[PDB]
Amino acid sequence: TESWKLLESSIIYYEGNPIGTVAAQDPELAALNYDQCFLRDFVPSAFVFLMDGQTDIVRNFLIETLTLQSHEKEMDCFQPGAGLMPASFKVESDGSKEYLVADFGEKAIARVPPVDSCMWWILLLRAYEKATGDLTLAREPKFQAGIKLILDLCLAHRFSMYPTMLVPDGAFMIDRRMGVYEHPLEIQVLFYAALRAARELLLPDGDGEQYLNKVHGRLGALQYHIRNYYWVDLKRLREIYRYKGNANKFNIFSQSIPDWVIEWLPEKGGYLAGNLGPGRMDFRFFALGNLMAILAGLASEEESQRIMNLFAHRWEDLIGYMPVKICYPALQGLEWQIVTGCDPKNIPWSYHNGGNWPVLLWLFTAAALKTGKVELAHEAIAIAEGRLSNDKFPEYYDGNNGRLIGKEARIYQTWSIAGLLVAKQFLANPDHVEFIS
Amino acid sequence: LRETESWKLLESSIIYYEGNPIGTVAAQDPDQCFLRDFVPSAFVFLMDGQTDIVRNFLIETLTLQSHEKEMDCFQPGAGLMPASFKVESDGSKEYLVADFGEKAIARVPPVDSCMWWILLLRAYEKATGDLTLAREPKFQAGIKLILDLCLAHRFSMYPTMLVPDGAFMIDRRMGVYEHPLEIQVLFYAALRAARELLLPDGDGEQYLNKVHGRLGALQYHIRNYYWVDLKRLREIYRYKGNEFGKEIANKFNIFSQSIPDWVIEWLPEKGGYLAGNLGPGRMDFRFFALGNLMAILAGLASEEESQRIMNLFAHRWEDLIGYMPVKICYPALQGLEWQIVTGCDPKNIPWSYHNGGNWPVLLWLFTAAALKTGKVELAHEAIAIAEGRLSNDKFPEYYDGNNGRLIGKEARIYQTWSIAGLLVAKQFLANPDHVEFIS
Amino acid sequence: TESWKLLESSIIYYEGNPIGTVAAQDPELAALNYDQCFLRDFVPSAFVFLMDGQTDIVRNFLIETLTLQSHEKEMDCFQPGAGLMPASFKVESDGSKEYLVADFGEKAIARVPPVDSCMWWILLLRAYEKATGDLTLAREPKFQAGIKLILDLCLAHRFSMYPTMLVPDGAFMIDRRMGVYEHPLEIQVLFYAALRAARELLLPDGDGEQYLNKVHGRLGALQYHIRNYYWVDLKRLREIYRYKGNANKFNIFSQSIPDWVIEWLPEKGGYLAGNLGPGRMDFRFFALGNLMAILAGLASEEESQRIMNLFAHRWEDLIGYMPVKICYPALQGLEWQIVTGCDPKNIPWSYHNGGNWPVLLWLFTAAALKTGKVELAHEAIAIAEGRLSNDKFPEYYDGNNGRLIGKEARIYQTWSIAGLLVAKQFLANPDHVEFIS
């Protein structure tokens, strides 16, 4: 079919071998960095290849990125943690020899750190092991060392009383300044998910035993903290609205609860908030964080049900014309200005700021399946299928309900293409959902 | 239909000049004849068969054109028609006095008045069968003088007609300057009429050549650049800014971030409309009813395009028709935009008058367009709504509010074209062949 | 000196001959259309060459543009008036042959019409005749025909009761949407100035006699209308503020007089307003319109004095760090949005919207000289000289007082360079001011 053929065209070969897929195949626009392979972008590609049985590419991807981990990465005589995985890479030729060049954030726009990338790497490594049955790769000293360098960076002692992870703005899939600084849901959910993965991956050698305990320790803390403090429902909103200023551990002034939240939430709906920090709660709903919370089992069974109840009751908002809304609602007017620095790629209901992202369909489908809401997966896929092909698989969609093709969206965006495929594969064989859960 | 209340108010409205009927007053609110206002009145009379008044009207208004008018030490184009005229008595004789814009509030020029004159002449012709009138040397000269002004050479590459703000039914500053839809549509319609009405005799062939050239360029321009639907909207939203060259998509440099949020949500999948205005760096996305409805009747819109406009009305019935047909334009300018665009004009406050008001007269255009596209149920529902209020409300000039719940703030009562509007619409409904006069 | 050498480098040769100067010599930025010769840009260049005695270039410029007038210009099967001069032109090669390509507005951004260009052409033709003493050029049938085609376009009967000229937005030096639609001062002043020029240029043959009368007729009307209706001073503001709604011929609601105007105007200051139309008066101050009104003698003697009194009392606003402010004040916030269509090149105090333009120094100097305010010319030139060279002659400056180098300004902008030169030439020999007056 059309989609498989596009996916194969996106494949990047290195020394005769396939090692990844390009971000997009848009002929008209500037190559920019979309000719590169992004670690976060490759995940849904990997899943298609894993399910198809052609696993070489995923193995090689993991081997090459592990080697990139060891590359030299710096800006102005300062090195980040050694475990840092890159945002993306591409294949360059100096005459006859081929070599890999990575962007670890020293080339990236706004110099954002690709914090979710080392998380996805660990998750994908686990996904690869479960899908193939190849235990050989994770056992090697190289990979054990690489997992450990990541954990060193994650579990490093920081100035905080909480087990969450502190990041600058634009740390995850949202790579632009969007007020997702401090402790955004996505990073915490993926952090948790990566810690869970690390348990089966870490060999319990003398050194490893030290790591597994730290992992198990943080997993517990992290789950308590996210479920008790990030969780939002009407019951919880009533509690927060009545809190005293200066029980409230984060000093939330109830006048700082938005109007829209109260009217938006159905009685049986709920979700994990976007962010938590001193004097601050981000009541914006972030899709990927919430769906992965379901998949990774971070959310409880009821909480998972309440999230899908929320998608059901607020379908136009969160799915509309193109699944899935990245976050809701959009920053608008002056708020857009202060929070994003007048970032013109993120105008209201566009891109990170309220846009609709096809790739997220694969997470929505998995999470719908895990919670038994099959009808919702059918409808979301039906919606996506009706437009994507005709629209040439746009990177994103814009507007309250995703009616517009994204303002600066690239066409033939690989994870949009891969997102649809993976969602159809899950629908055909729901047991494959185990790989991401 | 002559026994009915409306007809009686219409007969009362008639102005007489030396024992001859020449027009109708704007209102009988407890005055003078506006050229644009007379059109619906004329339509009722012609269908009923009283044509002497329409004929006399065209004669008298043609004579006024030749009158010498000036502002200060400068005189404007010879072919300019007046906004209105009235009968002032010497005491010993009756004579006609005209307002060509030199007496008008805001000193605006009535461009549409000339348009409507030509259209009414054709309307006269096609209803009576009388060809003699338009063929008279006087009328040929009159038509030509109007064409001289419309076909005035331009500095720009736009085949549209350049005008100042408030140059049509909206006679007050409303941000309708430059290239407003209504004017372009009536311009097109006036050119069409000029194809039949003009004689190739003498200088006639030279005029027909300029007319035919413009009709094509103008039709192409409006359909390709003013037309708005989701498909087209998606293209514009993805335009890159600051494109320079002969072959480029964004010829008018529209910045997508400037496109309002309401438009995206307002359009139905199967609906569409022609934009309010188009100029350098600007697109007015406001829906304008008279321009859009005339674009259907004059055949300026294609068949599909005409269907897609009526789909919009149906899908957005409360916004466009609501309590009183028909919303003059949507949406209202509000807050700081109303200030900047209208100059804090207290008569055009949000959802009032020109700025989002509902105007009875527009019902006849809506009915005509409904019939022509075969959506009769819409004309019927529209007439039903209007019929239920007007008589009781004493036929107000317009209505105010998002949906026209309020009677117009400064609306005149017993407004003639409000009355005529309803009569015309009913006459079209009874005999849909009468729609051929404006098409 | 540095400036002469830069000016010569800008010179454009055609078939071995110099025919004009490029807009800018900025190496780093995209060539765009700044590699072209703009008719409005060439004027201050021409003046330098006229004063230097090397006049060939100006003669050839006029001959070539006259030929361009006769070129085919259209968009979508519609032709503008035959007299339309182009915005700009450049030299192209098809192998060995060289040919001229013009932009008449069918290539221009936003499709703006270069209405001021045919005006400057006539003015420059007159300037050339007076400076050189060459009466040969304007007498030729070609040039008489060309002047006449322009007049046909200008004096064409339009739907208006006034003698002013109706234009779309972006018709003059301000080539972007800036609320200068309808009847902007600049067009009216230049129109007047061009009509005055046409009197000495038009041969009084049988055909010409018909033209001269129309010219003389319009000159009178136009001057009355501009002086009586556009003129602004406190006396006039008091009159307008007390006007009744619905004496007031343009229906100006006194609540639509801005606050800033009243406080801004000194007792002995005055100016010609930016625009006049139905229900509308643009109280913004536009520099070029006002200065040319002085030069062309459109303004009276006292009115000219009151304009310079205004520059003197409001020097920081209108001159500040870089002469001269193009218009004051800037459109801001929401007003910028509605009026300019969120045009990012025209953000507040930037470019057309409140920017400071070096080129305008040559008009300021001429107008200061004509009115006897020599000290003001010295100071304005002193100010300009201190920055321009070091800044590499930026196209424009930004900010309330022109502290910033213009946001997207090109460097080595020819009319910035030429502007300074012409202003120094005028200061050295004030009798040369006659050429533009």
Ligand SMILES: OC[C@H]1O[C@H](O)[C@H](O)[C@@H](O)[C@@H]1O
């Ligand atoms: O498609 C590759 C990249 O595109 C954009 O930069 C997205 O914001 C980022 O999340 C993605 O990884």
Ligand SMILES: OC[C@H]1O[C@H](O)[C@H](O)[C@@H](O)[C@@H]1O
């Ligand atoms: O009824 C006479 C006039 O009334 C109002 O002024 C309307 O704005 C105008 O369109 C109409 O022609």
Ligand SMILES: OC[C@H]1O[C@H](O)[C@H](O)[C@@H](O)[C@@H]1O
């Ligand atoms: O410098 C050439 C051109 O540059 C910019 O486009 C200016 O707005 C314009 O006035 C000038 O003619």
